[PDB]
Amino acid sequence: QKDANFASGRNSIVHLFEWKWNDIADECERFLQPQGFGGVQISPPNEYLVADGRPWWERYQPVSYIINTRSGDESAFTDMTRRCNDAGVRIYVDAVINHMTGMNGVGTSGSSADHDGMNYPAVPYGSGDFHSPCEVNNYQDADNVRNCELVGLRDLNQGSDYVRGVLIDYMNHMIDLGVAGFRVDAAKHMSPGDLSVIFSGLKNLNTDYGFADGARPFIYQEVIDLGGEAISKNEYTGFGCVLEFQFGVSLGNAFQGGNQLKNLANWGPEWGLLEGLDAVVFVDNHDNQRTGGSQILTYKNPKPYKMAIAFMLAHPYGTTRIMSSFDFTDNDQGPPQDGSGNLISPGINDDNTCSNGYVCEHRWRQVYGMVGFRNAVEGTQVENWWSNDDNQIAFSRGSQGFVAFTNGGDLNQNLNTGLPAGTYCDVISGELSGGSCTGKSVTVGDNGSADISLGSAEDDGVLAIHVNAKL
Amino acid sequence: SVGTSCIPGMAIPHNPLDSCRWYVSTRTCGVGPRLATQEMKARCCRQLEAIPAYCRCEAVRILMDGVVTSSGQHEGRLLQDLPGCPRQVQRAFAPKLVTEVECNLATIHGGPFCLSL
Ligand SMILES: [Ca+2]
Numbered sequence: 001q002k003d004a005n006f007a008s009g010r011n012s013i014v015h016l017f018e019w020k021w022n023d024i025a026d027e028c029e030r031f032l033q034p035q036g037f038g039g040v041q042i043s044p045p046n047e048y049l050v051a052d053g054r055p056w057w058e059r060y061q062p063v064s065y066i067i068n069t070r071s072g073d074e075s076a077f078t079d080m081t082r083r084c085n086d087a088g089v090r091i092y093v094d095a096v097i098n099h100m101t102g103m104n105g106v107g108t109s110g111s112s113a114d115h116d117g118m119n120y121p122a123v124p125y126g127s128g129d130f131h132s133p134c135e136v137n138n139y140q141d142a143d144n145v146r147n148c149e150l151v152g153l154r155d156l157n158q159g160s161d162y163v164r165g166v167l168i169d170y171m172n173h174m175i176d177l178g179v180a181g182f183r184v185d186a187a188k189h190m191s192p193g194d195l196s197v198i199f200s201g202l203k204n205l206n207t208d209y210g211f212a213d214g215a216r217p218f219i220y221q222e223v224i225d226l227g228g229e230a231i232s233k234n235e236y237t238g239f240g241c242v243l244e245f246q247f248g249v250s251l252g253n254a255f256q257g258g259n260q261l262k263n264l265a266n267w268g269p270e271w272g273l274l275e276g277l278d279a280v281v282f283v284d285n286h287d288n289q290r291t292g293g294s295q296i297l298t299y300k301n302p303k304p305y306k307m308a309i310a311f312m313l314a315h316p317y318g319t320t321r322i323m324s325s326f327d328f329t330d331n332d333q334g335p336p337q338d339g340s341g342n343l344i345s346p347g348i349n350d351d352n353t354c355s356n357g358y359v360c361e362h363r364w365r366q367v368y369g370m371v372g373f374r375n376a377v378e379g380t381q382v383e384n385w386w387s388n389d390d391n392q393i394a395f396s397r398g399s400q401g402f403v404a405f406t407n408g409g410d411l412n413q414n415l416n417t418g419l420p421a422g423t424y425c426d427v428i429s430g431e432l433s434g435g436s437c438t439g440k441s442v443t444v445g446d447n448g449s450a451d452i453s454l455g456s457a458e459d460d461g462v463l464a465i466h467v468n469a470k471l
Numbered sequence: 472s473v474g475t476s477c478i479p480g481m482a483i484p485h486n487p488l489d490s491c492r493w494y495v496s497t498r499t500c501g502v503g504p505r506l507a508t509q510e511m512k513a514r515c516c517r518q519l520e521a522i523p524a525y526c527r528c529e530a531v532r533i534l535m536d537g538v539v540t541s542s543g544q545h546e547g548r549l550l551q552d553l554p555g556c557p558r559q560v561q562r563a564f565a566p567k568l569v570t571e572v573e574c575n576l577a578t579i580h581g582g583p584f585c586l587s588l
């Protein structure tokens with residue numbers, strides 16, 4: 001199923017990268033709910049290998065399915081799902097089911113990981129539960145990609161009645177605990193057929209967490225397809241949504257001046273994107289903010305970055321995901337920790353920004369502002385499209401919100417916003433707070449017309465107003 | 472995630488470990504360009520350092536055996552036969568580039584060693 005199972009009036013999933021369960025439970029209540037966010041994508045919660053230096057990537061080397069990691073134990077986990085759901089925020093588990101470890105060691109819960117002899121006692125998995133060792137090295141060969149070891153990690157065999165049952169048990173355990181869905185890691189290295197069988201054995205969502213009767217777990221799958229391979233994202237859309245990686249590449253390239261913003265008129269499938277309701281979109285994720293290349297926009301290039309995030313949240317295409325990063329200078333660098341490997345919780349300081357090194361993009365004004373905008377314009381189509389035939393475009397979402405962009409030149413124009421007459425607070429430059437706008441305001445006449453001004457030297461290159469940020 | 476980005480054009484540059492070609496050749500057979508072995512080691516270990524730990528072993532594997540990508544293009548397998556230097560002896564030295572004695576670089580296995588190579 002391709003239904004996020006959000007609570008009414010909520011939108012967007014936030015990847016709270018490396019957060020602990022206690023901290024997520026708080027954020028759901030103190031910030032996520034009030035701002036109307038739909039859900040949280042957590043880091044793998046199942047026992048993984050303890051690696052030297054405790055890098056971020058250790059989470060992707062499973063050791064068992066015992067819920068006990070640096071993010072917290074099962075009690076902490078259940079406390080989180082209980083508290084977050086009651087606040088209308090859903091929890092999406094990062095499911096690492098394609099492999100186990102790439103070496104011998106111990107896991108976050110003390111379990112043994114015998115890579116050499118393929119024994120994972122805590123599951124248990126033995127050598128007969130894995131594919132015969134070989135190396136992934138040919139992307140024009142789907143059997144090689146799926147059946148061989150990815151960077152030396154023991155490749156599980158989901159074609160097995162045993163392994164399938166183990167994986168369905170793990171996932172069903174997560175559902176009994178109130179999770180709303182799953183982010184499927186390395187789906188590209190697994191077979192559509194096997195996944196179809198596994199996903200189909202998953203129980204309906206646990207109604208004791210505020211889920212409609214008969215609700216089905218949401219499934220979005222990681223398949224990095226930019227074309228020309230024996231494997232296609234289209235082979236996975238029949239049983240779930242697929243993470244659309246072409247999105248970030250095309251927007252990132254456009255918003256850095258690589259393309260003319262006027263061409264976004266036909267944004268969507270016209271560009272080679274999945275059909276919107278099969279896609280889960282994002283500007284950047286935990287992997288490509290590190291090694292995505294020139295086309296990917298990250299917090300390190302905030303101006304174009306925020307413009308791209310605004311466009312994503314203003315446009316009706318697909319389910320939206322927001323990256324919430326921890327500051328880093330090196331690609332192997334793990335989250336803020338102390339000498340014993342304990343994680344350092346982010347601190348919410350005065351101006352509701354975070355301390356201790358977490359970037360907290362989701363607490364950026366321009367980000368929760370547009371999450372508010374996407375909630376206000378819900379159920380509307382893109383209307384009043386305008387463009388200067390170059391790097392300036394604008395359009396409204398029905399008659400509930402307007403948005404302008406400039407990636408070249410100053411925008412000082414009278415445009416039809418299609419909004420009811422009134423004074424609106426730009427949610428990009430400021431916000432509505434106690435009868436005033438802390439930033440720019442816009443006065444909409446009776447013709448739905450308004451004089452829009454957005455100079456190219458401003459801190460932001462986007463302006464956004466909607467019917468819920470009106471005086 | 473992680474291993475998923477160990478592909479040329481992503482966490483790994485195109486034609487990775489370019490300079491290590493001549494480094495394994497001279498170290499292994501005394502065959503190579505007329506420049507300081509210390510120099511070549513430096514260049515090679517530099518290229519290797521620029522690749523994050525999680526893709527290091529995969530980068531050497533590509534240097535050794537090669538890779539067929541999304542374009543259908545093959546990349547790597549630079550460690551080919553040279554007069555007086557058979558490919559296989561070279562190919563056997565390659566995994567040693569991350570060890571303490573050489574570049575001493577951490578990898579996905581946690582330490583300065585490339586299992587499964
Ligand atoms: Ca596999």
Ligand SMILES: [Cl-]
Pocket residue numbers: 222243285
């Ligand atoms: Cl992802």
